Design an enzyme around this catalytic site. Structure first.
Site, PDB file in Angstrom:
ATOM      1  N   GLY B  27      13.158 -14.106   1.290  1.00 13.56           N
ATOM      2  CA  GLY B  27      14.308 -13.750   2.113  1.00 13.56           C
ATOM      3  C   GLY B  27      13.925 -13.210   3.473  1.00 13.56           C
ATOM      4  O   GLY B  27      12.736 -13.082   3.779  1.00 13.56           O
ATOM      5  N   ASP B 145      22.948   0.769   6.162  1.00 15.06           N
ATOM      6  CA  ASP B 145      23.254  -0.599   5.735  1.00 15.06           C
ATOM      7  C   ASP B 145      22.940  -0.991   4.286  1.00 15.06           C
ATOM      8  O   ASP B 145      22.098  -1.854   4.026  1.00 15.06           O
ATOM      9  CB  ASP B 145      22.671  -1.617   6.716  1.00 15.06           C
TER      10      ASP B 145
END
Lengths: 10, 355
Positions: B27, B145
């Site tokens: 990722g 986040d």
């Protein structure tokens, strides 16, 4: 109440 | 022949220590592609995040160094564990690409949310979430986040946090940084944030978990807002008059709402049958959600409130809840600007310690 020791990601 | 070697992963190069092979990718982080690998030496799976010439930008450099430090000084069994940094280049002159070597969790939330959980599991995962959260909080640091794609779990049901490009102390002091869905109103409608922003996410995340899908979806940054107050309901006048006029004008203009009750928001038909003695009730998780999914940032729950809370405290271990904050050597603070080049130093500087 016992903490779990497995988790399934089958 | 020398210390390193390269592999062609797609249109990317990883030049890395012979000791690490067999790189699949896995990722992107905030600003690096990340790669799964074998540690020859340790004989164990790792993650490697590479960040290409991070110093290229006040964005990059800042929110990279952050990670560096943060990663290092960080110390808690609910954050992902750094295992190595390096750079192949010869010196500041030559310098550009960094690599960060970390632990390789089995998976991540995205597809935990998938299966249907027993209360205990659900609860535990949350539990830990927060304890990790507690950690940086206890050091003034805010993740900013948190999301599925940021939480990783292990097949024993351990759980950790990722990526620290975003993490810092309060503000404002940076617009569309954070992920759309888990944006908290004090952000959505940029008013400036404080540390129980993180709580909100936890709410969605948990919600999502229970829900089966994204809690507040929303097709564009603006449409988000609606989704929130669709389900949650038009906030008070008392809230309103805190927004910036320019913005509020619109918000007020947005049609009024009761929103649903958490119960209808999250019916039981979704929860599993219940625990032995209570604490682990459906009503109780609702009651959690209830205190975290609160449009008002200031009328919201704390983490130590979230850990006091009944659905959570059942696993309460203070040696998990209240260990030392990490130490940030204060020469670094998550705010101050530097030069086109000043940065290139800081990093190489900060890298050179670590490696």
């Amino acid at each position: 109440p016992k903490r779990p020791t497995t988790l399934n990601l089958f | 022949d020398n210390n390193f070697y390269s592999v062609e992963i797609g249109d990317s190069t990883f030049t890395v220590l012979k000791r690490y092979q067999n790189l699949k990718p896995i990722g992107s982080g905030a600003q690096g592609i990340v790669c799964a690998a074998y540690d020859a030496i340790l004989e164990r799976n790792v993650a490697i995040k590479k960040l290409s010439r991070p110093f290229q930008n006040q964005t990059h450099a800042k929110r990279a160094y952050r990670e560096l430090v943060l990663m290092k000084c960080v110390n808690h069994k609910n954050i992902i564990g750094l295992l190595n940094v390096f750079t192949p280049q010869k010196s500041l002159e030559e310098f550009q690409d960094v690599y960060i070597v970390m632990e390789l969790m089995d998976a991540n939330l995205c597809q935990v949310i998938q299966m249907e959980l027993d209360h205990e599991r659900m609860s535990y995962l949350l539990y830990q979430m927060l304890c990790g959260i507690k950690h940086l909080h206890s050091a003034g640091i805010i993740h900013r986040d948190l999301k599925p794609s940021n939480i990783v779990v292990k097949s024993d049901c351990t759980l950790k946090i990722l990526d620290f490009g975003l993490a810092r102390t309060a503000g404002t002091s940076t617009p569309y940084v954070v992920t759309r869905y888990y944006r908290a109103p004090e952000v959505i409608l940029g008013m400036g944030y404080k540390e129980n922003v993180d709580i909100w996410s936890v709410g969605c995340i948990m919600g999502e978990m229970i829900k089966g899908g994204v809690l507040f979806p929303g097709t564009d940054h603006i449409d988000q807002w609606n989704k929130v107050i669709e389900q949650l309901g038009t906030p008070s006048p008392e809230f309103m008059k805190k927004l910036q006029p320019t913005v509020r004008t619109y918000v007020e203009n947005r049609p009024k709402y009761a929103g649903y009750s958490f119960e209808k928001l999250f019916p039981d038909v979704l929860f599993p049958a219940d625990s032995e003695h209570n604490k682990l009730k459906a009503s109780q998780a609702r009651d959690l959600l209830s205190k975290m999914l609160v449009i008002d940032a200031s009328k919201r729950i704390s983490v130590d409130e979230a850990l006091q809370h009944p659905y959570i405290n059942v696993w309460y271990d203070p040696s998990e809840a209240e260990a030392p904050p990490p130490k940030i050597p204060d020469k670094q603070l998550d705010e101050r600007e530097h030069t086109i080049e000043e940065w290139k130093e800081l990093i190489y500087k900060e890298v050179m310690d670590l490696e």
